Write an enzyme that holds these catalytic residues in place. Structure first.
Site, mmCIF file in Angstrom:
data_model
loop_
_atom_site.group_PDB
_atom_site.id
_atom_site.type_symbol
_atom_site.label_atom_id
_atom_site.label_comp_id
_atom_site.label_asym_id
_atom_site.label_seq_id
_atom_site.Cartn_x
_atom_site.Cartn_y
_atom_site.Cartn_z
ATOM 1 N N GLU A 404 28.091 24.265 -5.166
ATOM 2 C CA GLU A 404 26.625 25.059 -5.530
ATOM 3 C C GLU A 404 26.727 26.489 -4.594
ATOM 4 O OE1 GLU A 404 23.595 21.299 -6.273
ATOM 5 O OE2 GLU A 404 23.176 22.641 -4.387
ATOM 6 N N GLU A 489 27.692 16.042 -9.461
ATOM 7 C CA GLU A 489 26.521 16.008 -8.527
ATOM 8 C C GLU A 489 25.206 15.257 -9.218
ATOM 9 O OE1 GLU A 489 25.959 18.306 -4.641
ATOM 10 O OE2 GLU A 489 23.547 17.764 -4.742
HETATM 11 O O1 LIG Z 1 15.555 23.048 -3.014
HETATM 12 C C1 LIG Z 1 16.799 22.642 -2.617
HETATM 13 C C2 LIG Z 1 17.638 22.461 -3.892
HETATM 14 O O2 LIG Z 1 17.573 23.467 -5.029
HETATM 15 C C3 LIG Z 1 18.137 23.577 -6.038
HETATM 16 O O3 LIG Z 1 17.551 23.332 -7.245
HETATM 17 C C4 LIG Z 1 19.598 22.931 -6.248
HETATM 18 O O4 LIG Z 1 19.811 22.579 -7.602
HETATM 19 C C5 LIG Z 1 19.553 21.893 -5.243
HETATM 20 O O5 LIG Z 1 20.712 21.121 -5.173
HETATM 21 C C6 LIG Z 1 18.968 22.306 -3.931
HETATM 22 O O6 LIG Z 1 19.620 21.305 -2.692
#
Ligand SMILES: OC[C@H]1O[C@H](O)[C@H](O)[C@@H](O)[C@@H]1O
Ligand SMILES: OC[C@H]1O[C@@H](O)[C@H](O)[C@@H](O)[C@H]1O
Length: 803
Positions: A404, A489
């Site tokens: 991410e 994930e």
């Molecule tokens: O709000 C936190 C989250 O926001 C996002 O939508 C990400 O895809 C997720 O993995 C993250 O931890």
């Protein structure tokens, strides 16, 4: 020995009121400092702090600055040896000093690092002073990091001419072909450092032994020059006749012994364990290991060990991974950092596949004091350290360049991706590169147009990991028919062990006043899915290699959806709680992933007469009949269905991967009888109404452990009624008294919303159970654990330690 345990006889103090900068000086007075052995996590020893700079994200446990010092002498028998100080890992931003001189600074919290101290030691039996500053200024982490020298510390002692650190690379090129001709071709690349002041001529002898220690192959290299201060490189080929392959069922490892020869004399010996195995990600067929097609039944795992915190322990991490293998798991993702060497040993010995992941950020920080601020200068060093450490490990199948990563939307992220993949491939070309990517999720419904920079990054890695992006599994395969896709994930459903709330409501990212989440697979984060929905999307597609659920085990910190909601301090995402106690969803994954017939009823059976209980059965049986006090409440059945390529699965005509009754509550015994298509009984499960709490019952997972100072017995403490039925909602305080050749390493109950101490000698039961972790010392003998609770009968268990 070539490697010495350097864990003993340290001193530690946190920097609080007054500066410890003087603690680098040999002369500094540390006589009042705490005395301890490593590994050590100073955060897990502290009380929870609602005001912590770690916030909920880091589990409300303080880090800050801490110092380690060790005063030691060097034996006479080590003069003219090369000596390195080896850290397996320090979280984080450490500075090491020897005899008042800086050896270096190491930003990254999750890699090993090594300093050559040969020319810096006082050898005359004079006192040496080693000082380590650990700087975990917070916030640094989206999850619980721990703070300090949380992995093992070693000295490496060799002759001036020696196999380099990570100096061997054992491969089995074209193993499929060779195996069909009843061999493994073994390619060995060996790095020899000449740290002497004069060139030498060097040969390498490579001998392969089987697990019994029978020689099965050998080869001597050509002689080569190693100039003073340089590395010579050797490459030798040999053959194992009728090789034993490393597989999930048979995790067989050979041992390479490398002899370094100068004029016929052995000046160094070095061992490398390795396995012979091949695997493939296929764009249309998905994954196979040694030619056997299979889905990746994967989990994500953070590095903490619950009540141990970050302080590594071979038995504790082995126990975590045993429990995952019992759930039907075949693969792990080291979210989001290199794993410990104890973790590696467990997946190698248990038969689990591993994705090693280097980074949770590139240049763009996620948290003020994370690695982002170091990345542009240290990334190349840290990614090559991960690949170089692990390249001989049969369990490792893929290198992940990140999770991410915000940068992947920028042309800067493209250049970084190309650099990371190139640096990895300078060390190892035998495993695919991958990334875990969440920014294609879009609306969760329609196929998302790929950002151009993300698209070029998906062309740069070998295998594309999608985070939370089920809406793209088919569309991206059709648009990009050479892509190898998996779910890096998935799900992020949230659940509390033994909690059965809002039974018929499916809520996204919803907080309740109880500070818990429901175990009816009906709480999950807004970006996520139910366990069932994430699995069905994967199950139905041959091309999709499989998935890594968020998460296998609960970990400390990230109590989503309870953001900034002290005392919510640890996760709800795990199939299994921090104490190693399965939640109901553990049995749902067994039902989808395992062949051995099973059936698991939820919920518990302590309700109010007349109330209609939602009863589910997680089972891989064709059908189940439910009994209440010996009388049938009806059969529920699956259809025996087939995917579009004829893989069989069990699902109801209504699309459910579980069976369901509505049962008007009557006290007594609820029994599930699972049957095959012919009505033959293949498994059974039962839950009994518990009476008033009466006793504390202890059960050791292992009654015999090693007297080595680190081995552990995991003791379950249950609250049972007079007939020994667990009281499913019990919360009694259990007081532990240990005597004998051991100590209490920690206590836990898996309650995400508890701020009870992990490092204590008491713990409340949560949904009927608590955990005590018993650790051996170096003297063999007996350990006694006594567990008492107000108004109940006490529990007792003896642990035997062997030397
Ligand atoms: O709000 C936190 C989250 O926001 C996002 O939508 C990400 O895809 C997720 O993995 C993250 O931890
Ligand atoms: O849903 C929570 C999870 O989702 C995302 C991320 O990769 C994980 O580290 C964790 O934050």
């Amino acid at each position: 020995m070539r490697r010495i345990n350097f864990n003993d006889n340290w001193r530690f103090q946190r920097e609080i009121s007054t500066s410890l900068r003087e603690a680098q000086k040999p002369s500094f007075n540390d006589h009042s400092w705490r005395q301890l052995s490593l590994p050590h996590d100073w955060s897990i020893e502290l009380d929870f702090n609602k005001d912590s700079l770690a916030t909920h994200e880091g589990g409300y446990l303080d880090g800050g600055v801490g110092w380690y010092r060790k005063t030691f002498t060097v034996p006479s028998a080590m003069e003219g040896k090369r000596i390195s100080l080896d850290f397996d890992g320090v979280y984080m931003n450490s500075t090491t000093y020897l005899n008042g001189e800086e050896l270096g600074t190491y930003p990254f919290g999750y890699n090993a690092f090594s300093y050559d101290i040969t020319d810096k030691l006082f050898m005359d039996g004079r006192e040496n002073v080693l000082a380590v500053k650990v700087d975990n200024t917070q916030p640094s982490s989206r999850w619980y990091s721990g703070s300090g020298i949380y992995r093992n510390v070693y000295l490496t002692v060799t002759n001036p001419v020696h196999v380099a650190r990570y100096g061997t690379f054992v491969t089995t090129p074209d193993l499929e072909s060779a195996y069909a001709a009843r061999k493994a071709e073994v390619n060995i690349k060996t790095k020899i450092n000449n740290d002497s002041d004069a060139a030498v001529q060097v040969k390498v002898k490579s001998t392969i032994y089987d697990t019994d220690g029978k020689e099965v192959a050998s080869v001597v290299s050509q002689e080569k020059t190693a100039a003073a201060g340089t590395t010579a490189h050797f490459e030798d080929n040999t053959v194992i006749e009728n090789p034993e392959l490393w597989s999930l069922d048979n995790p067989y490892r050979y041992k390479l012994v490398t002899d370094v020869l100068i004029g016929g004399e052995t000046v160094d010996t070095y061992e490398t364990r390795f396995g012979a195995r091949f695997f493939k990600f296929d764009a249309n067929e998905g994954f196979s290991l040694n030619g056997k097609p299979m889905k990746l039944y994967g989990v994500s795992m953070h590095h903490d060990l619950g009540a141990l915190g970050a302080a590594t322990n071979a038995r504790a991490v082995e126990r975590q991974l045993q429990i995952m293998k019992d759930m039907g798991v075949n693969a792990i993702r080291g979210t989001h950092n290199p794993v410990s060497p104890e973790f590696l040993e467990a997946v190698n010995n248990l038969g689990l596949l591993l994705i090693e992941e280097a980074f949770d950020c590139w240049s763009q920080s996620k948290k003020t004091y994370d690695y982002g601020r170091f990345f542009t200068r240290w990334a190349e060093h840290d990614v090559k350290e991960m690949v170089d450490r692990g390249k001989n490990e049969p369990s490792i199948i893929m290198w992940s360049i990140g999770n991410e990563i915000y940068d992947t939307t920028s042309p800067s992220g493209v250049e970084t991706a190309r650099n990371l993949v190139r640096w990895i491939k300078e060390i190892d070309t035998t495993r695919p590169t991958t990334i875990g990517e969440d920014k294609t999720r879009g609306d969760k419904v329609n196929v998302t147009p790929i950002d151009p920079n993300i698209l070029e990054i998906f062309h740069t890695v070998d295998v594309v990991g999608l985070n939370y992006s089920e809406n793209n599994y088919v569309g991206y395969h059709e648009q990009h028919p050479n892509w190898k896709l998996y779910g890096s994930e998935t799900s992020s459903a949230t659940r509390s062990r033994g909690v059965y709330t809002h039974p018929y409501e499916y809520n996204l990212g919803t907080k309740y006043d109880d500070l818990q989440q429901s175990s009816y697979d009906n709480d999950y984060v807004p970006w996520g899915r139910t366990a069932e929905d994430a699995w069905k999307s994967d199950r139905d597609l041959k091309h999709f290699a499989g998935q890594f659920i968020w998460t296998g085990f609960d970990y400390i910190g990230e109590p989503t959806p309870y953001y900034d909601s002290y005392p919510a301090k640890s996760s709800y995402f795990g199939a299994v709680d921090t104490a190693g106690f399965p939640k109901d969803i553990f049995y749902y994954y067994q039902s989808q992933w395992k062949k051995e017939p099973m059936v698991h009823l939820l919920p518990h059976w302590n309700w109010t007469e007349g109330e209609p209980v939602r009863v589910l059965a997680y089972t891989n049986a064709h059908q189940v009949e439910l009994f209440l006090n010996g009388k049938s409440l009806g059969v529920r059945g699956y259809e025996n269905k087939k995917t579009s390529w004829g893989a069989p699965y069990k699902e109801t005509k209504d699309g459910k991967t579980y069976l369901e009754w509505a049962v008007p509550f009557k006290a007594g015994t609820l029994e599930a009888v699972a049957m095959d298509e012919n009505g033959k009984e293949i498994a059974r499960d039962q839950v009994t109404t518990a009476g008033a709490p009466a006793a504390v019952k202890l059960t050791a997972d292992r009654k015999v452990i090693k007297a080595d100072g680190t081995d552990l017995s995991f003791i379950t403490a249950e609250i049972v009624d007079s007939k020994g039925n667990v009281v499913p909602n019990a919360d009694h305080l259990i007081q532990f008294h240990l005597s004998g050749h051991g100590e209490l390493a920690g206590v836990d109950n898996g309650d995400a919303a508890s701020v009870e101490r992990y490092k204590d000698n008491k713990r409340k039961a949560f949904s009927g159970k608590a955990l005590a972790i018993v650790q051996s010392n170096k003297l063999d003998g007996n350990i006694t654990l006594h567990a008492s609770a107000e108004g109940l009968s006490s529990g007792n268990v003896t642990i035997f330690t062997t030397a």
